[PDB]
Amino acid sequence: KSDFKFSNLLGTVYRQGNITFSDDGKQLLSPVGNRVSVFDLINNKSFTFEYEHRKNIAAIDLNKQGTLLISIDEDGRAILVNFKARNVLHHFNFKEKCSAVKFSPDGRLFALASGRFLQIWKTPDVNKDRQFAPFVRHRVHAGHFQDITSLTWSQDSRFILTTSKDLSAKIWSVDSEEKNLAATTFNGHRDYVMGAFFSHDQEKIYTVSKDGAVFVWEFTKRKYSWRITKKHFFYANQAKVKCVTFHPATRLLAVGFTSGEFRLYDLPDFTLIQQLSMGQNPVNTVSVNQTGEWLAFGSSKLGQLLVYEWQSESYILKQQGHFDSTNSLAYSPDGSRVVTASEDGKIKVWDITSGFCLATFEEHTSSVTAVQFAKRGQVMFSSSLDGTVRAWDLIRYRNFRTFTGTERIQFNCLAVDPSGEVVCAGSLDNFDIHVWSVQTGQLLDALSGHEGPVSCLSFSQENSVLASASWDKTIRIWSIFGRSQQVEPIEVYSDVLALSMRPDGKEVAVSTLKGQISIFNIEDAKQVGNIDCRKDIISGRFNQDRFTAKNSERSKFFTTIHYSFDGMAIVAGGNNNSICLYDVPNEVLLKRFIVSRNMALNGTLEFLNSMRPEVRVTSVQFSPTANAFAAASTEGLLIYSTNDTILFDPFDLDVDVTPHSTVEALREKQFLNALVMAFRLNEEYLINKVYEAIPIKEIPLVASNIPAIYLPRILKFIGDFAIESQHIEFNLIWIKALLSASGGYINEHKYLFSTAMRSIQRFIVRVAKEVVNTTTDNKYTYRFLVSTDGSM
Amino acid sequence: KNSKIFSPFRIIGNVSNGVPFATGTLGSTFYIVTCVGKTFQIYDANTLHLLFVSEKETPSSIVALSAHFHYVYAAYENKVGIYKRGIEEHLLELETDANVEHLCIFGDYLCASTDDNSIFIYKKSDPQDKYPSEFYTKLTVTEIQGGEIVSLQHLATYLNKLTVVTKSNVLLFNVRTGKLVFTSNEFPDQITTAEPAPVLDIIALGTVTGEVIMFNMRKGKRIRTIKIPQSRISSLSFRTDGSSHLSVGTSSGDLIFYDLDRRSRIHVLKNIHRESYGGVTQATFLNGQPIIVTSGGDNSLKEYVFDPSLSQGSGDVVVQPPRYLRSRGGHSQPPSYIAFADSQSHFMLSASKDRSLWSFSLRKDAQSQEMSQRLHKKQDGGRVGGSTIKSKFPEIVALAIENARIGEWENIITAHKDEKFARTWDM
Amino acid sequence: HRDTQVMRTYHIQNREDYHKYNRICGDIRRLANKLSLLPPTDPFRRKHEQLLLDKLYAMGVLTTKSKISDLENKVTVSAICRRRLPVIMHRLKMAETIQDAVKFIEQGHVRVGPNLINDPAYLVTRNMEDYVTWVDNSKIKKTLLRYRNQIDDFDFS
RNA sequence: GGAUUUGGUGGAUUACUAGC
C-alpha cells in the first residue's frame, strides 16, 4: 500500500540518441532524454529502467549477450545496467562528449568513439562481483583530423573503422598483430561521411556522405590496394543523408535525409526498394535488427519513433509523443484506457497494459486543459483554452457536440455529471460556471457568484453535487438538480487552485496557495482537518534565478490533488519537483517522490554548482486498479505501481506460520487453512501455490469458509492475477463463488469494495467477453452454412 | 568461512596505521599507497582521492610497502605481493619461516629482508618482464658482520650494489656476485631510519639519540652530522626542489626542517601526529616539488607545503614556515556505535572511543568530516557550565537519527556514556 | 533614434528590446496588408482578422476592436511596450515611478496569481491585468498595510 | 576567561581507474 516504485514512463517514445534493437530483436529500446525505455514487440509491453540518467541520453550500447546495457550522457557519464538484473552494476565517468558506443560481436571489449579519439575498453564480466574500479581502457587512437561522426564494428574484433567528418575514413584492427593487415584511411570522399559499412566479405568497404553520393571501395591489383570500383549516387533536390544504417547479411541500406524522406537500397544491386516520408522533419537515428525485418526511424524535431518492416508493408509500432507536455490526465472506468491532454490540443489515448496510443484527436485547435470521463465507456469530455468544449465517443471516435459559451470564453477546467446529463466548465476570463446539457448543446445556465476565476470543478458521484473552486479564498458548493438552486459557501485562507472530491461524496479536498491541503465536509460547512505541505515540497532553483531555492514562492503549493478510491490517501503534485502521498486520517505523508533528476530541465536542483523548460507535474490521478497513480510530468506521463511485490508485508503471523507449513496444509488437504496461512504472509508465490492447487469440488465450500475480513483482499488478488494468466475457466469459478457465497455482503459494503469490483470487471470485459463473442460468432456462422441451401 | 550472501567490498574509515607509506609516480601524476592492516589503499597526491584498494585481504598484516611505477610491492608475513591496480597478479613466496621486515626494488632485482638477518634476491626473468619473479640467491648477514637490519636502500648509480643499513653499521652487497664489496665502520648509536640523498654517494642516517648522520660511501666517512635534543628519529626526507632542505621526523610527534646550506633549522612542526600512536612514521618531500607528505600512526595523512619566500632579493634566507594543506582523517580508536545518515547511503555517522564523532562518506572518500563540538551560545543568556580547558564529549553508546526534517532543526540524538543528559546534533 | 527614445520612456533592459517588438509590430501590418488584398466578401477574410482582433485586444495592444484602421495606424511598439509589467505596475499605481517598478520586480515583490514573476519584461494580457498583486508576506506589502493601520499578522502580512 | 565583526588559505559543493 505504501511502497510505490517507478514502474513505467508513458508518452515521449523517442527524445534523443541512438535507437538499437536487441540481439534476439524481440525487444526494441528507444532512449528518452533522462531515461531508457525498452519496448517488447512480441508481448506489446513497455518497460523503463528505474535509474535516472543525469542528463539526456546521447548514445545507447547493447551487448550481443544482452547482459550489459550502456547509455552515454552529454557530460560523458557511463551507466551500465544488466537487462535481466535491471540494476546499475557500475557508473564509470567518461570525460568528453560521446557520439556512439558499439559493443564488439565477440563482446570481450566495447569500441567507444569520443571526438577524434577511438577507444576500446575491456568489458567487466556481469557474472563477476562488483569492483571499486571496473572500467579499464585497452587503447586510444588520436590519428583523426576531426572527431569521428560514426563507429562501425566487423564480426572479428581485429578491425574497427570510424568515419571522420573531415572527409577521411580510417580502419583500426583490434589486436596489434592485425595492424599490418589494415591501417589505411580512405580519401577523396566529398562533403562528410555519415557512416562506414562492412559487408560479410571484408574485400568491399561501403562509405556514405552528407552530399548523398555513395562510393564503394574494392581491393584489387592496379602491390595493389583499395581502389574505388564503382560509385553509387542518390538524387535528392534538397535532402542530405543525416544517419545511415547498413545490415551486411541482408545488404539493406537505411538513409536519413533533412527532408525526412525514407529510402532503402541494396549494396550489391544498388536498387531503391522504397522511398517514404516518415515526417517533414529529417530522421536523426535509424537502426536495423539482425534479421533486418524491423527498421526503427526516429525524428528528434517531431519527437516521434516509427518502426517499419522491409519484407511486408506493415508497421509493428508507429506513434508520436506530445510536442510539449500533457496539461490534464484522464482515467476511464476500465484501468487499461488512459487519456492525456496536451498544450498543442491534440488528444491521444494511451493503454495501461501496453505503452502505445490507440488513436489521436485533432478536433481541438487550441490547447486542451482538462480531460475527464463520465461514469460510462461511451464518452469523455475535454476542456480547452479555445473557448469551446467537445465531447468524444470511444466506440466511434467522433464529436457528439461541441459545447460553446455565449461570448467565446477560454475554458480551463471541467466537471461531468456521473449520470452523464450535465457538463460544467470554468474559465479565467469570465469566472462564471457555464453548464451544458449533454443532449441539447445549449448552455442550460450560467452559474455565477465567484469573485476571481474558477480553478477547478468536480461532482461527487454519490450525492450528484458540484463544488466550485475560486481565487476569492471561498469554496462554494453548488446544488443544481431539482428545484433547489441553493449554493453553500465556505471561506478559505488562500487562493484555492486544487479541488478534490472523495468517492464517498461527503468530503472535499482542496489545495490552497499557502501550501496547506484542507479537507472539508459537504453536508456541514466545517472542516475535518488540514495537512501541512509547505515544508515537504522540494523546489528547484532555476538557472536564471536570483533567489535561493529555500525562499522562492514558485512551487510550494499544489496544482493538483486526487483522492484514492479507498478514500484514505491523497496524491498531490504541482509546479515543483516532488509528488506526495498524504494519509488522510493520520494526516501524515507516506512517501515523497522526486519526479526527475535532470540538469537539462530547470526545476531539479535545490543547489546549483558554483529559458530552460521548468519541471513540474500538471495533473495527477490514482487508477481504479490502484496499483499506481499516474502523474503527468514535463518528461512525460509517469506511472508508479506495486506490481513488483518484493516486500514482506505480513498480517497476523503466529510463530507456527512458516511458508513450509502452508505447503504441508495442501498435503493435509486443509484448503481453507492453507489459503488463510498463505494470506497471513501476503506473498504472491505462496498464494499462487495454494490458489492453483485446490480443486473445483471444494471451491464453494472454501468460498463459504472464507472470512468477511479477507473477502476484499482475496477479490483484489484474483483481479490482478487473472488478466495475464491462461486460466479463464478456473478463475471465473472463483469469481462465481466469491459473488455467490456473499452477494448481499459485497452489495451492502459498496464503499468497502471499490478497487476489487473495478479490477474484477475489467478482466471480464477485456478478455473474458471477447472469448465469448468469438465462441458466439463462430457458432452462428456454422449454423448459417448448414441451414442455408447449397449454391448452384 | 566462505559466505554465500556477503563478500567484502573494502574497509572504510582507515587511512594509515604506522607502516611507512611509499610514494610512486605515473606520468605527471603522483600516487601514494598506505596500508590498513591486511588491506592496503592508494591515494592520489593531487587531491587525495581514493584510487585503488586491494581486491582481497592479505592473510596477515602488511609489514612494509614500496611502489615502482605501476606495481605496488606489498609485503605481509612470509610472502611479497606484486600488485597492479589493487589486483594480485603475481604472488612471490620467500622460503623461510621468518617474517619479512623490509623491502627494496632496483633494476632487475627485488630485495626482501626477513627478520632473521637474511636478504633474498629476486631477479627479473627477462628484461622485457616488469615484475621480478625468479629467485636469484639468498644473502645473509651474520651478527659479526653487522647488527639487525634497519632498512634496505639502493643508492643512485651503483651497479647491483645494495646499501644494507643495520643497527650497527652499513653494508654493500653486489647481488650479481653475492659478495660484500664494502663494509662501513661501527656507529656509536643504534640506527633507526635511513634515507638516500639527491646528491651522489650519500645516504642519510637516523639514530635513537637525536643525531642525523650524513654518510658517504665513496669515502666511507661521515660528512655532516646534526644533533637533535631528546628525540628518536623516525623518518627522513630531502627536498629535491633545488633548495637544500632536510626533514627530520621524530617519534615524539615533531617534524623538524633544516637548511643544510645555511646550517640552520627553519621551522619545527609540533604534534602534527600523535606522540602516543607513534609520531611521524613517514615523511617525504615529493620529487622536485615543495610538498612534504606526513603520515603518522594515528590514522591520518597530511600534506604540508612551503609558500614562496616573501623577500624579493634575498630568497633562500627568509623562508616561509610550512603550511597546512589537504589531509584525510579517520578514527584513532575502534568505533562504538554507528548509523547511516540517509537513504542513498551517502553518509555514515561513526562515534568511537576516541570521543569524536565522524560523518564518514561511503561515496567519495575525501568528503568525510568530524562533526564539530562547539556549543551554541544559549538563548537564555546565562553562561554555559563547563570546564574551560575544552575536552571532548564522553563516548557515544546510543544514537538516533530521523532524516525527515534536516537543515531546519536538530535530527540526531546521541546518548553519551555515563551522563544523565543526552545531547543533540544537527546533521 | 526612435528605438532609444522609447526605451527611455518605458525603461527597457536591452536597447534591442524595441526592435524586438517592432519586428512583431511590423509583422502585424504585413499580415494586415495581405489580408487587405483578399476580396472583401470572402468568408475567410471576414472571419480571419476578427479572429485576430480578438487576440490583439485580449492582449491589450489596441484600444478598441471595432475600428479596423487601428490595426495599421495604432499598432505601435510603444503600444505593445506599455502592456509591459512595470508599466502596468505604474498604471495601477503600485510603484511610484516606472524605474521603481523595475526595481520591485527584480527584487521579487510582485506576482501574477500563484507564481511570482521575475522577468521585468513580462507581457500582461488585459484579462490577466486583473491579477497582479504584491507577493504575500513581502516587506513592501507589509508597509502598505501599516499605513492604513490594518496589518494582520495572522496572515503574517 | 567572555562576546561581536573581519582578512586569508585548505576540504566539500555529481559517484574515487595515475602525468607527458
- Residue to mutate among B42, B56, B85, B344, with most A CBs inside 10 A, is B85
State the CB neighbour count (10 A cutoff) for residue B386: 9
Rounded to whole angstroms, the Cα distance separating C10 from B200 reads: 80
DSSP state of A766: I
Residues 6 or more apart from C153 whose CB is under 8 A from it? none
B21 SS3 class:
coil
Angle between helices A711-721 and A728-741 (to 10 degrees): 160
| Contacts with A133 from chain B: Cβ below 8 Å | 51-52, 85-86
Contact between chains at A129 and B7 (C-beta distance less than 8 A): yes
Residue A588: closest C-alpha in chain B:
B404
| Contacts with A431 from chain C: Cβ below 8 Å | none
DSSP H or E run through A470: strand A465-470
Residues 6 or more apart from A532 whose CB is under 8 A from it? A515, A516
Instruction: For chain B, give the number of residues.
Output: 427
Angle between helices C43-58 and C17-34 (to 10 degrees): 160
* B206: nearest Cα among B194, B221, B198: B194
Residue C135: closest C-alpha in chain A:
A553
B51 part of contact set with chain A, CB < 8 Å = yes
| Residue C60 identity (one-letter amino acid) | G
- CA B344 to C1' D11 (Å) is 22
Rounded to whole angstroms, the Cα distance separating A336 from A352 reads: 4
Helix (H) and strand (E) counts in chain C: 8, 3
Angle between helices A671-681 and A659-668 (to 10 degrees): 170
Which nt is closest to the CA of B384, judged by C1'? D2
Distance from first CA to last CA of chain B, Å, rounded?
A: 38
Grid coordinates given for A280: 517533414
Rounded to whole angstroms, the Cα distance separating A448 from A431 reads: 7
Rounded to whole angstroms, the Cα distance separating A468 from A488 reads: 10
Could you identify the residue written with the cell 524595441?
A: C18
> Which positions on chain D have an atom < 7 Å from some protein CB?
1-4, 9-20
Subunits touching A (CB < 8 Å, at least 3 pairs)? B, C
Asked if residues B114 and B94 have their Cβ atoms less than 8 Å apart, the reply is yes
Could you identify the residue written with the cell 557519464?
A: A77
Distance from first CA to last CA of chain A, Å, rounded?
A: 68
DSSP H or E run through B35: strand B29-36
Asked if residues A459 and A508 have their Cβ atoms less than 8 Å apart, the reply is no
* B64: nearest Cα among B121, B17, B21: B21
Angle between helices C17-34 and C2-10 (to 10 degrees): 110
* A761: nearest Cα among A1, A753, A567, A700: A753
Instruction: For chain C, give the number of residues.
Output: 157
* A620: nearest Cα among A562, A558, A537, A565: A562
**H-helix segments, A742-791:** 743-748, 755-763, 769-787
Strands A78-81 and A69-73: antiparallel
Contact between chains at A132 and B7 (C-beta distance less than 8 A): no
Burial classification of residue C37, based on how many CB atoms lie within 10 Å of its CB (0-12 exposed, 13-18 middle, 19 or more buried)? exposed
Strands A517-521 and A507-512: antiparallel
C47 part of contact set with chain A, CB < 8 Å = no
Nearest to C127 among A428, A471, A575 (CB): A428
Grid coordinates given for A127: 557474472
Q: Which positions in chain A have a beta carbon within 8 angstroms of at least one beta carbon in chain B?
A: 129-133, 535-536
State the CB neighbour count (10 A cutoff) for residue B97: 9
Distance from CA of C99 to the nearest CA of A (A): 19
Nearest to B85 among A129, A130, A133 (CB): A133
DSSP state of C123: B
* A175: nearest Cα among A158, A155, A196, A191: A158
Rounded to whole angstroms, the Cα distance separating A518 from A492 reads: 9
Residue C107: closest C-alpha in chain A:
A546
Residue B53: closest C-alpha in chain A:
A132
CA distances from C83 to B112, C51, C112, C121 (A): 86, 21, 14, 9
Edge-to-edge, what's the strand order for the sheet holding A98-103? Answer: A98-103, A109-114, A117-122, A139-141
Asked if residues B33 and B48 have their Cβ atoms less than 8 Å apart, the reply is no
Whether chain B lies against chain C with 3 or more Cβ pairs closer than 8 A is no
Which nt is closest to the CA of B327, judged by C1'? D11
Grid coordinates given for A104: 564488439
Rounded to whole angstroms, the Cα distance separating B411 from B339 reads: 13
Asked if residues A428 and A408 have their Cβ atoms less than 8 Å apart, the reply is no
| Contacts with A559 from chain C: Cβ below 8 Å | 114
Burial classification of residue A226, based on how many CB atoms lie within 10 Å of its CB (0-12 exposed, 13-18 middle, 19 or more buried)? middle
Distance from first CA to last CA of chain C, Å, rounded?
A: 45
Rounded to whole angstroms, the Cα distance separating A74 from A717 reads: 44
Angle between helices A711-721 and A684-691 (to 10 degrees): 90
